[PDB]
Amino acid sequence: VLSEGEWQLVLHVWAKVEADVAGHGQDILIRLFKSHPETLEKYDRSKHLKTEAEMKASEDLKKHGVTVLTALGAILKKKGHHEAELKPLAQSHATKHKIPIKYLEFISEAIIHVLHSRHPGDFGADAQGAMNKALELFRKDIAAKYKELGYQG
Numbered sequence: 001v002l003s004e005g006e007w008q009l010v011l012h013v014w015a016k017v018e019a020d021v022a023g024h025g026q027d028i029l030i031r032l033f034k035s036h037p038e039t040l041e042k043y044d045r046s047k048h049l050k051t052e053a054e055m056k057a058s059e060d061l062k063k064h065g066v067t068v069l070t071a072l073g074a075i076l077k078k079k080g081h082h083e084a085e086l087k088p089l090a091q092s093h094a095t096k097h098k099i100p101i102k103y104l105e106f107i108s109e110a111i112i113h114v115l116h117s118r119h120p121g122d123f124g125a126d127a128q129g130a131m132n133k134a135l136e137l138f139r140k141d142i143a144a145k146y147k148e149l150g151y152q153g
């Protein structure tokens, strides 16, 4: 679905993310909450964080961003061959957290924004197109798994 060149652009910028997983995850979650505040409702503890500085100071949020980006990176590195990595994520996000696909679109937008903000020289139009294809594939495949579990979000 992605070409080998597209996967290489995805993994090239992902290596830059991995130089500071925690900082990238903080910026991505903070961007998600500021652009789409309704998403913050899904987090029992984090939803009580009232300012950007509190969000940046939160060890809980920082640890969570690392968990999120580690899971996403493990999926991306499979270059589409991600059933085993995607299934447990679909299970929890469909049946426990109840995260609609539109919220995965919102976080994909935040990922793109932060990648471009931090790595513009390694995240031009072709690299952005490749990352958008990879995240579109992630969202398509997770939506199919959602439906297999009975969730139409």
Ligand code: HEM
Pocket: 039, 040, 042, 043, 044, 067, 068, 069, 071, 072, 088, 089, 092, 093, 097, 099, 103, 104, 107
């Ligand atoms: C790139 C997309 C995402 C990835 C890779 C991801 C990954 C994860 C991982 C690995 C966990 C911990 C294990 C688990 O419960 O499955 C998790 C927990 C969670 N995620 Fe996601 N996540 C995604 C997007 C979202 C979005 C968009 C929301 C809400 C808008 C969300 C809210 C949840 C919540 C509420 C928890 C439980 C947090 C807790 O109580 O400790 N996630 N996520």
